[PDB]
Amino acid sequence: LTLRSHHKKYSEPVLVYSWHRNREAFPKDYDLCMSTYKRFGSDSPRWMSEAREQMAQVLVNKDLV
Amino acid sequence: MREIVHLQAGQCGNQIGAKFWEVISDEHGIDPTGTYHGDSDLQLERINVYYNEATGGKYVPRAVLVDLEPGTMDSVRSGPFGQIFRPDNFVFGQSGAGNNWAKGHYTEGAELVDSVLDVVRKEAESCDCLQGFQLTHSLGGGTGSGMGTLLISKIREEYPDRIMNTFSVVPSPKVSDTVVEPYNATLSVHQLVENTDETYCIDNEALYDICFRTLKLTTPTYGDLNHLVSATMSGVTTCLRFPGQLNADLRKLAVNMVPFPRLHFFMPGFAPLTSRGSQQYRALTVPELTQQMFDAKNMMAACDPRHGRYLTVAAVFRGRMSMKEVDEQMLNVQNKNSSYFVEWIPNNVKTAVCDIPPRGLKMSATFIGNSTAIQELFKRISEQFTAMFRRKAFLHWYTGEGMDEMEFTEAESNMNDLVSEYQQYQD
Amino acid sequence: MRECISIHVGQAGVQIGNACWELYCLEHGIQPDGQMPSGGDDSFNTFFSETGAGKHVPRAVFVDLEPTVVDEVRTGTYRQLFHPEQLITGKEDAANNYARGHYTIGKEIVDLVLDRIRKLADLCTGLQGFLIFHSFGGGTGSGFASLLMERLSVDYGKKSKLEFAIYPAPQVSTAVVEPYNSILTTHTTLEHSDCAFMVDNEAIYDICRRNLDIERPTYTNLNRLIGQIVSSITASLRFDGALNVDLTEFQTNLVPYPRIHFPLATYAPVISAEKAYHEQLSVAEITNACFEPANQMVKCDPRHGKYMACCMLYRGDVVPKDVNAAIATIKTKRTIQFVDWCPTGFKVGINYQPPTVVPGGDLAKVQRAVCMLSNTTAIAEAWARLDHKFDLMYAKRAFVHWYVGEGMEEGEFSEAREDLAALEKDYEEVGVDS
Amino acid sequence: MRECISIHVGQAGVQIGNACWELYCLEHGIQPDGQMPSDDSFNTFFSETGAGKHVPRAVFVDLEPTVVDEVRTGTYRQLFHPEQLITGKEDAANNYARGHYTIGKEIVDLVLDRIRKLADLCTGLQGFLIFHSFGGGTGSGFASLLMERLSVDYGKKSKLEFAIYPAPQVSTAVVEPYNSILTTHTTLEHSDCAFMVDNEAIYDICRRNLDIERPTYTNLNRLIGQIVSSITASLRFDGALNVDLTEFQTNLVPYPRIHFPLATYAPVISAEKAYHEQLSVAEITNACFEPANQMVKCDPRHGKYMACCMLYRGDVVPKDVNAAIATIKTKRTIQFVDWCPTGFKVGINYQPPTVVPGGDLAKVQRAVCMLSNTTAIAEAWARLDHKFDLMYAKRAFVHWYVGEGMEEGEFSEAREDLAALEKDYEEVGVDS
Ligand SMILES: Nc1nc2c(ncn2[C@@H]2O[C@H](COP(=O)(O)OP(=O)(O)OP(=O)(O)O)[C@@H](O)[C@H]2O)c(=O)[nH]1
Ligand SMILES: Nc1nc2c(ncn2[C@@H]2O[C@H](COP(=O)(O)OP(=O)(O)OP(=O)(O)O)[C@@H](O)[C@H]2O)c(=O)[nH]1
Ligand SMILES: Nc1nc2c(ncn2[C@@H]2O[C@H](COP(=O)(O)OP(=O)(O)O)[C@@H](O)[C@H]2O)c(=O)[nH]1
Ligand SMILES: [Mg+2]
Ligand SMILES: [Mg+2]
């Protein structure tokens, strides 16, 4: 006979509501095992502590004379 | 120093623990081999809290992985970081629990509870100044919900002073994958309340909603759910592992989130939750971090806090920031949502700062807090529990284990007694 | 590691074992000789055991009281695959007689089959369970299986015994004295079993005609479908999955009371390649197909009963997200009913590997599949019809002279009739709502 | 060095000497001529000559020529030196009296002289393996005589006794039990161990395990060859735990009047059966305790073990041996007396068993041999005493025996001794 269903897989190029969010979130997509996005950011880390900055300007700053 | 022992029970708990040990190894610049490939020095100064020293610049996490079925262990050893855990820390039984609380907790957990006893005692004597124990499991299972609670019963007698915090997984009423689930939950929550310093109600359905709408994931797997808990897992300890302007530890929140020992139930939250693509828009500031983390849709438990009164709230922020905007921000949201806070504790908010941001991301905040809306969770269990108990259904499985009938009645008495006194503080 | 031993009895047991073991060989990659040419590494350890010569031997016990059906295997394609000690034959059959299968001919080889299964259990380290395949109609598969399960429960009290057995059909019949053995096997399958999978052939006939378009199928078709169902139920043990579910898990989440262990099986999709060419399939698709009464493997309408407990096994490219959407949609139907004392009655398991397709089959290569085990009360009407016809023979004392000459006491007919009436009464008590 | 000299007697002895030495030639590499085509492991069985030949150190004896004449024209005709095969013109024809007092004395000196030269060749002799039958008169009457006259020549040298006891049900003779009684004085007085075996038990084992629905005596002959090869296997080839003949005599005989153990071999399977069954140490050690696998028609479950001896040979690791004996001690229907706490003796050999072409047992990597002393053997003699009294009461067949030259008092004494033998076994069967 036949089966009813609701929704479908579709494809990537074809118009579906939320296709745009699918393809913008495509970076780091893997669909099982593990996660998909890995680290929530991929930019540069930084290791300057507040006390370290507050202490290091005396060593290096505008050495006015 | 201040070390942490990570317990691990069940198919559920083993999969969150593997994901959690993944991120903080990625954070500390730890390769899957077990060596250090990080760059900064702060990445390697307090590695002793989670990683135990080995020869050749190698580190072993201080975890105890337990499951009554060995078939999950082969997936654990074969994962990405599958070899980074010590084989002696793999303790297992030959027969699983079959989703029976009584089978795991008494009949089959008794033989194997001595082996997990030996390793954690060995691991306890390895570190110098242990801060407390952590464990992740499921209340709808038979190993974590069953024998796993028996672990909680034993170690409080051995080590009472140490803080125990359970990131347990509470089943959903709308989505249920176990018929006998309200049983094992009911003989579980009674075991937590007597000995647990703080509890973290995790609901997959709530995490399920977040990946539906907040991250707009077409096909999210189980791993991203474990990633969000792992992110939540990292965001509470991060004030210890790295220096901060205003520091805290587990005790500083474990002392502060409980006004009375019967109240140790909290829902966790994570502030920055957007798409991977969209981070380059969403001009990132401290005020927007506040907006995401007082939204009920952001909450990862199965309860909406609008129907409850927020008893206590504690938030931990990360990365370099100057603090003025924060302290006025929960100063802001305390006045305007005044009806949603209790009146008998003024200034309900605790703050803490860790100077190190999580890897790759810039600013993040972690929300843990007590509120009345958690009482909504337990009463839904009882309405399922008594209906299935009114006909003595699914009972010969429990009766055949040698246990009696009153254990269901006293447990039904206890969390009814809990929700009664919990309700009394709402009004 | 988990091990499930097969205890197939009779002509039905042997044919079903042929289909199921060829399916296992196909999915594991076993050649009929029994060598590996090249989720999980020891995924064959649940069904096959290593030998010194690099050869895998199945954990199967074929027992038949007539040697033709087993000589077919001994001279078939899988002659070298099977231990000739594992195949056990009788010179003369029970001849469709429960008394012959239970008191005269079975006792000659009960010791032999006990020794064989003892060796098969000794070879394994951790035995998960015992899958007993038989039929109530045949005298061998009724009486000898009843005796074996009787002695098996006292030999191994703890080891689970799951029951896959083929019921007499409501309308068609391959026999006339089938209902007698049907009554007399009910006590044994009530007392010494943990769960049952009663199958009638008419529903499978209808499914294969209406869905797979086979107007003229054969018995190997139904046997392939049963093997597919058993592969689905053993998939969580054989391969890895997000939610691995053992036998004990669904035993716990399908049985409320010791006298209720009779759920219904259901496998979906069952379609041909000419249809799967075009029909898109999804979790909602397969879960809606699993609730069609014309799709049910028994000849009963669950709409005339109430669903008590459901165990679902999703397999393949399945995602819990769509699983839960399917669950919510299922919950939001009036026609689907549940008892007052089971507000949450779903037991979900998930496996990675999609089902494999044999050559010469009918099922198209499908990426997702689902198996459902539904304990419900609409099954009682089948035993009610059985009681009607059994009394409709028993009142005039027909066919009992053969049994009496074999040597049992005529009271047990009335006792078993009373037992089945009481069981129907108990199912009515469960169906009672407060 | 180590050496074994065989004194096989009777139509059994000639036929089992041929079969056993067929196996001995194949394992070392002796040609039927006697040539090595390619260290001195063969010295226990073979010996060098002046032409570089290897000659077996065996003495085949029979009192009828036609049995040994088939050997003299056989395949190995040029391997056996013709004097070592000894014949006689007339035989006893199933009578103990004729083979012990009339015809035996004719050939006593020549067989005794022959055994002197074979022993003269050897330097350090380890023991005498003796094979005969209780049924045949010449294998009983004469074999009894040499045992008395070998003991006076060598009082200390070991005399192992492999024998064919009559089967409980089937028989090749009616006058057989008489020979069985009066020979049991000899195997008591002038023997050091016993290995009685009835052909009925092997007839059972061969047809049920090796699938030969019609075996012959050769099939029975080969299996006994496998037993005697493994009991000597420690001497011939090196191993982790070498076990001499003097070694297992000590841990099998708690009392000198009790020297009647039971041998057991495992596995005994066909290649059709060997392909599908995995063979490990556990799977072969349990078969050595099954009553269906015994070569004597008696059930040890009706009795208790005094002393068990283990002969491990093949791909065998010391780890699984201790695990196998651990499980065996953990079985209740296997019983032991109160005064034997530890009743094992393990030996380990490295060379795996060989197959003869036209044989029955498939080539295997490991096996086990058992030598267990149990009191369940006692009921076998009681049946024999039962059968003896049903004919001694009627004085049947006795007129044959007295006419040969011996008195009528001896049958009473021989019957009495076996009752005393049976009585002593119950004393050990009693637990304090
Ligand atoms: N589904 C299915 N049913 C079968 C098959 N073979 C036999 N049956 C059923 O088994 C019933 C009769 O029992 P058999 O298996 O033929 O014979 P038996 O079990 O050895 O018992 P005896 O007749 O006494 O020898 C028939 O009514 C069939 O419905 C089969 O291959 N598939
Ligand atoms: N197992 C086995 N038994 C044998 C064999 N040859 C003879 N026998 C046994 O010997 C018994 C009869 O005695 P024989 O050995 O034939 O003759 P004998 O020992 O020379 O004594 P006499 O007949 O007086 O000459 C039979 O009952 C057989 O059981 C053999 O090759 N194998
Ligand atoms: N969030 C999350 N939940 C999981 C995961 N694995 C299993 N679960 C949940 O755990 C429950 C089953 O737990 P179970 O395996 O029976 O626990 P056990 O008896 O201790 O082994 C199910 O309801 C799942 O929803 C996971 O990786 N993440
Ligand atoms: Mg039949
Ligand atoms: Mg003779």
XYZ file of N, CA and C in Angstrom, chain D residues 201-368:
504
model
N 34.634 -52.419 25.050
C 34.657 -50.991 25.347
C 35.234 -50.195 24.184
N 36.309 -50.702 23.572
C 36.866 -50.048 22.391
C 35.918 -50.176 21.216
N 35.239 -51.323 21.103
C 34.193 -51.472 20.098
C 33.141 -50.388 20.249
N 32.775 -50.064 21.488
C 31.882 -48.932 21.682
C 32.535 -47.631 21.207
N 33.752 -47.334 21.664
C 34.327 -46.008 21.421
C 34.539 -45.768 19.929
N 34.989 -46.793 19.203
C 35.299 -46.644 17.782
C 34.055 -46.366 16.943
N 32.971 -47.109 17.193
C 31.781 -46.958 16.365
C 31.049 -45.668 16.704
N 31.037 -45.265 17.980
C 30.325 -44.026 18.263
C 31.130 -42.772 17.953
N 32.457 -42.810 18.057
C 33.238 -41.594 17.857
C 33.866 -41.515 16.470
N 34.411 -42.621 15.976
C 35.115 -42.630 14.702
C 34.227 -43.037 13.532
N 32.935 -43.265 13.777
C 31.912 -43.462 12.749
C 32.151 -44.697 11.885
N 32.980 -45.632 12.335
C 33.179 -46.891 11.627
C 32.147 -47.880 12.154
N 31.112 -48.147 11.356
C 30.061 -49.053 11.799
C 30.522 -50.505 11.833
N 31.574 -50.852 11.096
C 32.165 -52.191 11.144
C 33.672 -52.044 11.273
N 34.169 -51.854 12.489
C 35.616 -51.848 12.708
C 36.170 -53.265 12.714
N 37.494 -53.345 12.713
C 38.195 -54.611 12.850
C 39.236 -54.475 13.952
N 39.923 -55.586 14.237
C 40.899 -55.601 15.323
C 42.055 -54.645 15.064
N 42.335 -54.343 13.794
C 43.367 -53.363 13.477
C 42.993 -51.985 14.007
N 41.726 -51.590 13.840
C 41.267 -50.318 14.394
C 41.402 -50.308 15.909
N 41.077 -51.430 16.553
C 41.344 -51.565 17.978
C 42.841 -51.599 18.253
N 43.621 -52.203 17.351
C 45.064 -52.275 17.553
C 45.713 -50.898 17.523
N 45.244 -50.008 16.645
C 45.901 -48.713 16.494
C 45.715 -47.841 17.728
N 44.522 -47.870 18.327
C 44.246 -47.005 19.471
C 45.115 -47.371 20.666
N 45.337 -48.668 20.890
C 46.256 -49.095 21.940
C 47.670 -48.630 21.626
N 48.012 -48.540 20.339
C 49.307 -48.000 19.960
C 49.468 -46.542 20.343
N 48.389 -45.763 20.239
C 48.444 -44.364 20.648
C 48.650 -44.230 22.149
N 48.075 -45.143 22.932
C 48.252 -45.103 24.379
C 49.697 -45.409 24.748
N 50.262 -46.472 24.166
C 51.603 -46.891 24.560
C 52.647 -45.916 24.029
N 52.351 -45.229 22.926
C 53.262 -44.197 22.443
C 53.347 -43.033 23.422
N 52.204 -42.605 23.962
C 52.184 -41.438 24.836
C 52.736 -41.739 26.221
N 52.587 -42.974 26.707
C 53.160 -43.312 28.006
C 54.683 -43.347 27.933
N 55.242 -43.636 26.757
C 56.682 -43.614 26.547
C 57.164 -42.297 25.957
N 56.239 -41.405 25.586
C 56.584 -40.197 24.840
C 57.538 -39.286 25.594
N 57.522 -39.326 26.925
C 58.467 -38.526 27.692
C 59.893 -39.016 27.490
N 60.078 -40.334 27.409
C 61.415 -40.891 27.238
C 61.970 -40.579 25.857
N 61.174 -40.821 24.816
C 61.677 -40.718 23.451
C 62.068 -39.286 23.103
N 61.160 -38.339 23.307
C 61.368 -36.968 22.877
C 61.346 -36.034 24.077
N 62.032 -34.905 23.926
C 62.231 -33.979 25.026
C 60.923 -33.277 25.384
N 60.911 -32.660 26.561
C 59.716 -31.984 27.032
C 60.016 -31.168 28.267
N 59.034 -30.347 28.647
C 59.184 -29.507 29.832
C 59.205 -30.346 31.103
N 58.292 -31.308 31.214
C 58.198 -32.191 32.374
C 58.319 -33.629 31.881
N 59.552 -34.111 31.768
C 59.766 -35.502 31.403
C 59.379 -36.416 32.558
N 58.698 -37.510 32.226
C 58.143 -38.436 33.205
C 58.575 -39.836 32.812
N 59.453 -40.422 33.608
C 59.986 -41.739 33.330
C 58.994 -42.814 33.772
N 59.275 -44.058 33.378
C 58.446 -45.169 33.831
C 58.507 -45.317 35.344
N 59.686 -45.108 35.931
C 59.799 -45.118 37.383
C 58.998 -43.989 38.014
N 58.783 -42.899 37.274
C 58.109 -41.734 37.834
C 56.621 -41.986 38.044
N 55.933 -42.538 37.043
C 54.490 -42.689 37.195
C 54.108 -43.925 37.993
N 55.013 -44.893 38.135
C 54.747 -46.008 39.034
C 54.573 -45.518 40.464
N 55.354 -44.514 40.867
C 55.274 -44.052 42.246
C 53.952 -43.326 42.500
N 53.526 -42.449 41.585
C 52.277 -41.719 41.776
C 51.122 -42.386 41.061
N 51.043 -43.708 41.174
C 49.869 -44.469 40.771
C 49.537 -45.603 41.721
N 50.491 -46.073 42.510
C 50.344 -47.263 43.331
C 50.513 -46.854 44.787
N 49.416 -46.581 45.494
C 49.544 -46.268 46.922
C 49.895 -47.483 47.755
N 49.424 -48.665 47.366
C 49.736 -49.915 48.032
C 50.089 -50.979 47.004
N 51.083 -51.826 47.297
C 51.589 -52.762 46.277
C 50.549 -53.731 45.749
N 49.577 -54.122 46.572
C 48.508 -54.997 46.112
C 47.513 -54.279 45.213
N 47.632 -52.964 45.073
C 46.745 -52.166 44.241
C 47.603 -51.578 43.131
N 47.664 -52.262 41.993
C 48.432 -51.794 40.845
C 47.624 -51.996 39.570
N 46.350 -51.609 39.608
C 45.417 -51.869 38.513
C 44.687 -50.586 38.126
N 45.379 -49.631 37.510
C 44.729 -48.389 37.088
C 43.965 -48.596 35.786
N 43.337 -47.519 35.320
C 42.622 -47.510 34.053
C 43.205 -46.426 33.161
N 43.510 -46.786 31.921
C 43.981 -45.811 30.952
C 42.799 -45.115 30.281
N 43.045 -43.900 29.795
C 42.034 -43.167 29.046
C 42.737 -42.229 28.077
N 42.181 -42.103 26.876
C 42.756 -41.271 25.831
C 41.702 -40.315 25.296
N 42.140 -39.111 24.931
C 41.261 -38.097 24.370
C 42.119 -37.070 23.652
N 41.628 -36.483 22.556
C 40.377 -36.781 21.857
C 40.532 -37.950 20.894
N 39.441 -38.645 20.590
C 39.420 -39.678 19.555
C 38.266 -39.325 18.619
N 38.563 -38.543 17.584
C 37.546 -37.995 16.699
C 37.958 -38.216 15.252
N 36.964 -38.233 14.370
C 37.224 -38.303 12.942
C 37.409 -36.901 12.367
N 38.052 -36.842 11.196
C 38.301 -35.558 10.545
C 37.008 -34.884 10.115
N 35.979 -35.671 9.797
C 34.657 -35.094 9.591
C 34.172 -34.403 10.856
N 34.463 -34.994 12.010
C 34.122 -34.394 13.287
C 35.136 -33.356 13.752
N 36.403 -33.500 13.370
C 37.447 -32.582 13.808
C 37.369 -31.214 13.143
N 36.796 -31.125 11.940
C 36.735 -29.845 11.244
C 35.859 -28.840 11.978
N 34.757 -29.296 12.567
C 33.760 -28.401 13.135
C 33.896 -28.199 14.637
N 34.688 -29.017 15.322
C 34.871 -28.896 16.762
C 36.241 -28.287 17.037
N 36.264 -27.227 17.840
C 37.515 -26.643 18.300
C 38.046 -27.442 19.482
N 39.319 -27.817 19.421
C 39.930 -28.661 20.441
C 40.866 -27.816 21.292
N 40.555 -27.704 22.580
C 41.403 -27.017 23.541
C 41.733 -27.976 24.678
N 42.495 -27.473 25.651
C 42.908 -28.302 26.780
C 41.700 -28.720 27.606
N 40.768 -27.793 27.832
C 39.569 -28.121 28.593
C 38.710 -29.145 27.865
N 38.579 -29.008 26.544
C 37.694 -29.892 25.794
C 38.219 -31.320 25.735
N 39.528 -31.516 25.891
C 40.074 -32.866 25.868
C 40.237 -33.461 27.264
N 40.391 -32.632 28.298
C 40.558 -33.171 29.641
C 39.245 -33.665 30.237
N 38.105 -33.113 29.809
C 36.830 -33.587 30.334
C 36.429 -34.921 29.727
N 36.818 -35.168 28.475
C 36.507 -36.434 27.828
C 37.246 -37.604 28.461
N 38.353 -37.345 29.160
C 39.067 -38.411 29.851
C 38.352 -38.877 31.111
N 37.308 -38.173 31.545
C 36.524 -38.571 32.705
C 35.165 -39.149 32.343
N 34.770 -39.088 31.079
C 33.463 -39.594 30.681
C 33.448 -41.117 30.744
N 32.465 -41.724 31.414
C 32.396 -43.194 31.447
C 32.194 -43.826 30.083
N 31.615 -43.102 29.125
C 31.452 -43.629 27.776
C 32.766 -43.701 27.011
N 33.813 -43.028 27.485
C 35.102 -43.004 26.808
C 36.107 -43.957 27.436
N 35.661 -44.851 28.310
C 36.578 -45.730 29.019
C 36.793 -47.029 28.256
N 38.015 -47.547 28.340
C 38.365 -48.814 27.718
C 38.141 -50.010 28.635
N 37.625 -49.790 29.840
C 37.205 -50.861 30.732
C 35.724 -50.674 31.020
N 34.983 -51.780 31.022
C 33.538 -51.724 31.253
C 33.260 -51.603 32.752
N 33.488 -50.392 33.254
C 33.203 -50.042 34.637
C 33.053 -48.532 34.725
N 32.181 -48.088 35.625
C 31.901 -46.668 35.786
C 32.593 -46.150 37.035
N 33.556 -45.233 36.904
C 34.211 -44.673 38.098
C 33.270 -43.913 39.012
N 32.125 -43.446 38.507
C 31.135 -42.808 39.366
C 30.570 -43.769 40.403
N 30.633 -45.075 40.145
C 30.296 -46.065 41.157
C 31.402 -46.237 42.187
N 32.576 -45.661 41.943
C 33.688 -45.768 42.864
C 34.343 -44.436 43.153
N 35.633 -44.470 43.478
C 36.389 -43.283 43.849
C 37.806 -43.433 43.315
N 38.423 -42.321 42.924
C 39.785 -42.361 42.403
C 40.803 -42.420 43.533
N 41.792 -43.304 43.402
C 42.927 -43.233 44.314
C 44.025 -42.320 43.794
N 44.380 -42.460 42.522
C 45.534 -41.767 41.965
C 45.297 -41.588 40.478
N 45.436 -40.355 40.009
C 45.331 -40.025 38.597
C 46.686 -39.535 38.115
N 47.046 -39.900 36.890
C 48.285 -39.455 36.274
C 47.956 -38.787 34.947
N 48.608 -37.656 34.681
C 48.384 -36.848 33.488
C 49.572 -36.967 32.545
N 49.298 -37.285 31.284
C 50.317 -37.295 30.233
C 49.875 -36.319 29.150
N 50.372 -35.089 29.221
C 50.037 -34.066 28.243
C 51.074 -34.059 27.133
N 50.605 -33.907 25.900
C 51.479 -34.011 24.745
C 50.875 -33.233 23.587
N 51.690 -32.394 22.969
C 51.266 -31.555 21.873
C 51.422 -30.082 22.191
N 50.614 -29.272 21.507
C 50.584 -27.830 21.746
C 49.848 -27.595 23.061
N 50.591 -27.718 24.156
C 50.029 -27.647 25.497
C 50.843 -26.655 26.315
N 50.153 -25.713 26.948
C 50.776 -24.649 27.730
C 50.561 -24.964 29.206
N 51.546 -24.712 30.076
C 51.336 -24.958 31.512
C 50.190 -24.164 32.111
N 49.797 -23.051 31.489
C 48.719 -22.233 32.035
C 47.377 -22.956 31.979
N 47.040 -23.540 30.830
C 45.746 -24.200 30.706
C 45.699 -25.534 31.435
N 46.853 -26.145 31.707
C 46.869 -27.402 32.448
C 46.375 -27.183 33.870
N 46.883 -26.143 34.535
C 46.442 -25.862 35.897
C 44.992 -25.400 35.931
N 44.535 -24.715 34.881
C 43.129 -24.335 34.812
C 42.233 -25.539 34.555
N 42.719 -26.522 33.794
C 41.921 -27.712 33.516
C 41.750 -28.566 34.765
N 42.840 -28.798 35.497
C 42.748 -29.584 36.722
C 41.973 -28.827 37.791
N 41.947 -27.495 37.714
C 41.151 -26.718 38.657
C 39.664 -26.999 38.485
N 39.197 -27.064 37.237
C 37.788 -27.352 36.984
C 37.447 -28.796 37.329
N 38.383 -29.718 37.092
C 38.139 -31.134 37.360
C 37.951 -31.371 38.850
N 38.781 -30.729 39.674
C 38.584 -30.787 41.115
C 37.244 -30.200 41.523
N 36.715 -29.264 40.750
C 35.396 -28.714 41.028
C 34.317 -29.473 40.254
N 34.224 -30.783 40.503
C 33.063 -31.532 40.036
C 32.823 -32.606 41.093
N 31.574 -32.664 41.587
C 31.198 -33.525 42.712
C 31.086 -35.001 42.336
N 30.488 -35.330 41.182
C 30.393 -36.741 40.791
C 31.769 -37.362 40.563
N 32.796 -36.548 40.359
C 34.167 -37.027 40.443
C 34.558 -37.026 41.914
N 34.772 -38.214 42.463
C 35.013 -38.388 43.883
C 36.449 -38.821 44.130
N 36.898 -38.588 45.357
C 38.221 -38.994 45.792
C 38.112 -39.525 47.208
N 39.079 -40.349 47.590
C 39.124 -40.833 48.961
C 39.568 -39.726 49.897
N 39.385 -39.963 51.192
C 39.727 -38.956 52.182
C 41.235 -38.802 52.331
N 42.006 -39.836 51.997
C 43.439 -39.825 52.254
C 44.264 -39.481 51.019
N 43.631 -39.019 49.945
C 44.353 -38.525 48.774
C 43.879 -37.112 48.471
N 44.521 -36.106 49.055
C 44.096 -34.720 48.819
C 44.428 -34.228 47.420
N 45.646 -34.507 46.962
C 46.130 -34.085 45.653
C 46.556 -35.331 44.894
N 45.809 -35.687 43.855
C 46.044 -36.944 43.173
C 46.392 -36.815 41.707
N 47.215 -35.830 41.363
C 47.575 -35.564 39.980
C 49.076 -35.716 39.784
N 49.470 -35.965 38.539
C 50.876 -36.014 38.145
C 50.941 -35.598 36.687
N 51.404 -34.379 36.433
C 51.375 -33.787 35.101
C 52.734 -33.961 34.439
N 52.720 -34.387 33.182
C 53.907 -34.383 32.352
C 53.600 -33.664 31.054
N 54.614 -33.008 30.498
C 54.443 -32.181 29.310
C 55.423 -32.641 28.241
N 54.904 -32.927 27.051
C 55.697 -33.313 25.896
C 55.444 -32.325 24.766
N 56.360 -32.293 23.801
C 56.329 -31.282 22.752
C 55.969 -31.831 21.381
N 56.421 -33.028 21.045
C 56.101 -33.587 19.740
C 54.624 -33.967 19.697
N 53.851 -33.429 18.758
C 52.430 -33.784 18.663
C 52.256 -35.184 18.102
N 51.084 -35.798 18.279
C 50.887 -37.163 17.775
C 50.916 -37.227 16.257
N 51.358 -38.373 15.749
C 51.398 -38.611 14.318
C 50.223 -39.485 13.891
N 49.892 -39.419 12.604
C 48.830 -40.234 12.026
C 49.463 -41.283 11.122
N 48.927 -42.495 11.172
C 49.333 -43.537 10.238
C 48.396 -43.447 9.037
N 48.883 -43.664 7.817
C 47.965 -43.773 6.678
C 47.061 -44.984 6.836
N 45.791 -44.802 6.492
C 44.801 -45.820 6.764
C 44.354 -45.891 8.206
N 44.725 -44.913 9.027
C 44.311 -44.868 10.411
C 42.940 -44.245 10.562
N 42.577 -43.971 11.808
C 41.250 -43.454 12.113
C 41.263 -42.079 12.758
N 42.141 -41.843 13.731
C 42.182 -40.548 14.393
C 42.769 -39.497 13.458
N 42.092 -38.357 13.357
C 42.586 -37.271 12.528
C 43.815 -36.632 13.163
N 44.664 -36.049 12.316
C 45.846 -35.346 12.797
C 45.438 -34.171 13.673
N 46.008 -34.109 14.876
C 45.604 -33.140 15.881
C 46.858 -32.496 16.458
N 46.668 -31.323 17.059
C 47.757 -30.542 17.622
C 48.011 -30.836 19.095
N 47.024 -31.358 19.817
C 47.192 -31.634 21.236
C 46.254 -32.760 21.644
N 46.608 -33.431 22.738
C 45.833 -34.559 23.236
C 46.139 -34.754 24.715
N 45.523 -35.777 25.303
C 45.728 -36.115 26.708
C 45.696 -37.625 26.860
